[PDB]
Design a binder for this molecule. Structure first.
Ligand SMILES: CN(C)c1cccc2c(S(=O)(=O)NCCCCCCCCCCC(=O)O)cccc12
Ligand SMILES: [Mg+2]
Length: 131
């Protein structure tokens, strides 16, 4: 369902989201153009996600509901879990620097992967299409 290669198509309020997350105006400008590709593979509860962008090419492996660490592109550490809630992946992370929650949701709406992000009151969306 999520299992596919997804290339970002458009985003909503992502600049304010990034600015709230502490991203400087130079990397925000770049990020508007990051060309984020997610390649998601699922086996039962074990997921592999290859994130490719104009910043980096990494692979993140996680299990549903097993807390893991993930470094953002500026080296900010997140600690948290992904879960399945009905049809959605639910991400509950905290930054380990200030403990503030970064909550996120992946859902398929039609043929788009829609990822919502919420951080300190600011909500953004990134929408992906199949490659
Ligand atoms: C290169 N630099 C400096 C950056 C560019 C653009 C955005 C950046 C964000 S951000 O917070 O605004 N956007 C990224 C948020 C990702 C949060 C998702 C957490 C879920 C972990 C994903 C693991 C997986 O793929 O399953 C944070 C830190 C650095 C950023
Ligand atoms: Mg992401």
């Amino acid at each position: 369902a999520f299992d596919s290669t997804w290339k970002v198509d458009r985003s909503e309020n992502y600049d304010k989201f990034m600015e709230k997350m502490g991203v400087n105006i130079v990397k925000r400008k770049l990020a508007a153009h990051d060309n984020l590709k997610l390649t998601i593979t699922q086996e039962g509860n074990k997921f592999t996600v290859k994130e490719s962008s104009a910043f980096r090419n990494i692979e993140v492996v996680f299990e549903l509901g097993v807390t893991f660490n993930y470094n953002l592109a500026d080296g900010t550490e997140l600690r948290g879990t992904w879960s399945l809630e009905g049809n959605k992946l639910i991400g509950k992370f905290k930054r380990t620097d200030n403990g503030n929650e970064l909550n996120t949701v992946r859902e398929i709406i039609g043929d788009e992967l829609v990822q919502t992000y919420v951080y300190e009151g600011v909500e953004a969306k990134r929408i992906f299409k199949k490659d």
